[PDB]
Write a protein that binds this ligand. Structure first.
Ligand SMILES: CC(=O)SCCNC(=O)CCNC(=O)[C@H](O)C(C)(C)COP(=O)(O)OP(=O)(O)OC[C@H]1O[C@@H](n2cnc3c(N)ncnc32)[C@H](O)[C@@H]1OP(=O)(O)O
Ligand SMILES: C[C@H]1O[C@@H](n2cnc3c(N)ncnc32)[C@H](O)[C@@H]1O
Lengths: 307, 256, 103
């Protein structure tokens, strides 16, 4: 607090290492004065990816992470094998159907004004090359592929560029910068990570999962884009729905061809969620024998296939 | 340098992009008369490893070598009576290999995986040859390593090395979008030029298959417009046969 | 390469205790948190929203009641059932659970 009127901030950063290159993977923001001040931090001595935080106003938090890879799946004639990696305020994209680039380098590179927290791909069979990015300031940016790159200044070339080198590929361009508005204006929570498991299920529909703090309950949100007309740039994502579930949701999966959405609870029960229906009902997942399905143990990676 | 800094030294050597070489020569330290280290050893201030510790260390070091690196030699060749302290035996490599077999780990360098060595030390022959490619980053450049080898029996036949020129090249012939080939090699026994032997591996077309693939990476992935090769002289005639011309000390070819 | 994803969070708000928290430590095999303060010890279960034990170190003359004194370190001991606190003024108290004993 060098400035007299400056409001100090607290940040907790999670870093890892690669080929002797130090990445910046996660960033959490906390206040510094009042009930929100942090007193102590501690890593769990047994479980590798659990973090314990104790604040001042008799407040306790626990965070759980796991490793994952972000890839695109689509039709053979259209999809290019894509992989996105987070490096702080930049996102590195490698197109594996055309170039095979060692991990520290990349095919192209996207630059952002704030550190990035989540990266996801579209779930359309013929448009599986689009990208969505959510950063630490709670705004969602959308990058789409078109015939004309439009030469936006936020896209750079990696190892496929230089003086005299030329390779034919289609780079994306920025299209919107959405802003998320919640129910009225509130202090939210000392917890800075309220939207998790972000999933882009349609060119204007996102799904997110929020956790409660009194009962072991979870909420599924519907983020939809609303605009009166093409007034200007930027936009507004209005929460248009909310579904309540008993239990802790730990994974959400979707199928781009059959359009089915699957939820996993903390004990192992698998549920099917219908979003296009007017009832928004939730049902158990049935096997061939007509019985409900339960994983014997909590799985960390889930997928839906057609055997 | 103790017994714990050596492992860290070599782990950093093979994991840090600034260091990754193409070949290695391991020379355990020997103390010889008429040097400063000799004076240090007499004054009771320097002591060598015990032989068991040395064998264990060499086994652990050899377990870390990447599959694109070749080890040429494992110890010096000073006659035994002239050495005051240090290594005393003469077959450190095979003792280390036996110890590695005992511990359950395996060595996967280039020398101990090629057809001739696998043919004289063991008795095996390739059966199910396949094509393998490995990419990495080293010394500020994007390196690729192409090879033909048998996966099930772990047998190497032929290799090629390719690199995309960085932004700090000073040679006139390599500026403006040039990709350079650094080595092409096919192993086995020697087949004299213009001769053929159906029981050996050289003159059977594994070289023009490795160059056709190098010419596809350099044009569709690197985006270059020229390819250059460093070569000897008989290789100069060979590349002239393929379709390359001569410029300076290189054999170049347009890719447009 | 890969990157991290957050998949669960747990929060227990409005714990009530003697004063202001100063230190905390974990009980792994049981799944319980031990929080130290300016008066004594609290033991809280976060998955069920309850407090299980409470020991005062002020009534027995180990910590001043005027508002001064700290617990520098709180450490659980495996193969035991006792917690070893360390007063700032300088003492090594070995408290116990399932009772209110001190030593
Ligand atoms: C360029 C460098 O840095 S060195 C190349 C490696 N050096 C060596 O010679 C060690 C082993 N090398 C080899 O195996 C070969 O010489 C290579 C790598 C050049 C080509 O490997 P191969 O798979 O044997 O080549 P490939 O079978 O495709 O070609 C055979 C033809 O090359 C010819 N050839 C091979 N070496 C040479 C040479 N040095 N000069 C001229 N012609 C040669 C053979 O005579 C044969 O021609 P022909 O049968 O039509 O009369
Ligand atoms: C020719 C190579 O021999 C190695 N070399 C030089 N002196 C010694 C020694 N006393 N013991 C072992 N290796 C030595 C060095 O690595 C040199 O580069």
């Amino acid at each position: 607090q060098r400035e007299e009127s400056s409001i100090p901030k607290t940040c907790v950063q999670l870093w890892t290492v690669g080929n002797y290159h130090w990445y910046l993977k996660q960033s959490l923001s906390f206040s510094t004065c009042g009930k929100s001040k942090i007193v102590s931090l501690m890593w769990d001595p047994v479980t590798p990816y659990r973090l314990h935080v104790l604040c001042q106003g008799w407040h306790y938090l626990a965070y759980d992470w796991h490793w994952t890879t972000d890839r695109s799946v689509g039709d053979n004639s259209s999809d290019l094998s894509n992989v996105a990696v987070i490096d702080g305020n930049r996102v590195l994209v490698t197109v594996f159907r055309q170039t095979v680039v060692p991990p520290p380098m990349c095919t192209y590179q996207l630059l952002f004004p704030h550190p990035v927290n989540q990266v996801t791909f579209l779930a359309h069979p013929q448009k599986s090359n689009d990208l969505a990015v959510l950063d630490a300031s709670n705004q969602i940016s959308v990058y789409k592929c078109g015939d004309c790159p439009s030469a936006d200044p936020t896209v750079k070339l990696g190892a496929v560029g230089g003086s005299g080198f030329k390779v034919c590929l289609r780079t994306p361009h920025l299209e919107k910068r959405y802003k998320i508005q919640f129910e009225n204006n509130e202090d939210q929570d000392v917890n800075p990570l309220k939207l998790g498991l972000l999933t882009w299920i349609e060119e204007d529909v996102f799904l997110a999962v929020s956790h409660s703090e009194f009962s072991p309950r979870s909420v599924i949100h519907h983020l939809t884009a609303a605009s009166s007309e093409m007034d200007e740039e930027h936009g507004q994502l209005n929460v248009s729905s909310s579904a309540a579930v008993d239990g802790v949701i730990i994974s959400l999966c979707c199928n781009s061809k059959t359009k089915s959405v699957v939820l996993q609870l903390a004990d192992g029960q698998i549920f099917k969620y219908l979003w296009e229906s007017p009832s928004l009902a939730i049902k158990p997942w049935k096997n061939s024998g007509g019985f409900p399905v339960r994983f014997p143990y909590p799985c960390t990676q889930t997928e839906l296939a057609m055997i | 340098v103790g017994l714990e800094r050596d492992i860290e030294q070599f782990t950093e050597f093979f994991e840090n992009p600034a260091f990754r070489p193409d070949g290695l020569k391991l020379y355990p330290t020997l103390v010889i008369r008429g040097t400063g280290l000799y004076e240090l050893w007499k004054s009771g201030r320097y002591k060598s490893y015990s032989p068991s510790d040395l064998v264990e260390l060499v086994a652990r070091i050899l377990a870390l070598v990447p599959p694109w690196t070749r080890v040429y030699r494992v110890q010096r060749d000073i006659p035994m009576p002239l050495v005051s302290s240090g290594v005393e035996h003469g077959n450190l490599r095979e003792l280390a290999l036996a110890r590695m077999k005992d511990l359950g780990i395996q060595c996967r360098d280039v020398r101990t995986r090629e057809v001739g060595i696998q043919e004289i030390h063991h008795k095996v022959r390739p059966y199910q040859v396949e094509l393998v490619r490995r990419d990495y980053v080293a010394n500020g450049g994007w390196e690729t390593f192409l090879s033909y080898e048998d996966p099930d029996q772990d047998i190497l036949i032929g290799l090629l090395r390719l690199r995309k020129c960085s932004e700090e090249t000073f040679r006139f012939e390599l500026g403006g979008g040039v990709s350079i080939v650094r080595e092409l090699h096919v192993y086995g026994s020697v087949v004299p030029v213009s001769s053929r032997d159906p029981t050996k591996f050289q003159h059977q077309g594994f070289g023009m298959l490795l160059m056709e693939e190098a010419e596809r990476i350099a044009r569709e992935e690197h985006g270059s417009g020229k390819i250059a090769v460093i070569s000897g002289v008989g290789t100069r005639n060979y590349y002239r046969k393929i379709g390359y011309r001569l410029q300076g000390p290189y054999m170049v070819k347009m890719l447009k | 390469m890969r990157n991290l994803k957050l998949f669960r969070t747990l929060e227990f708000r409005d714990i009530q205790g003697p004063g202001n928290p100063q230190c905390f430590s974990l009980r792994t095999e049981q799944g319980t948190v031990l929080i130290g303060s300016e008066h004594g010890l609290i033991e809280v279960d976060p998955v069920s929203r309850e407090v299980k034990n409470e020991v005062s170190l002020v009534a027995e003359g180990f910590l001043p009641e005027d508002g001064s004194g700290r617990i520098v370190g709180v450490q659980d001991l495996l193969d035991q059932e006792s917690v070893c606190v360390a007063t700032a003024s300088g003492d090594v108290i070995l408290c116990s659970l399932s009772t209110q004993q001190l030593e």
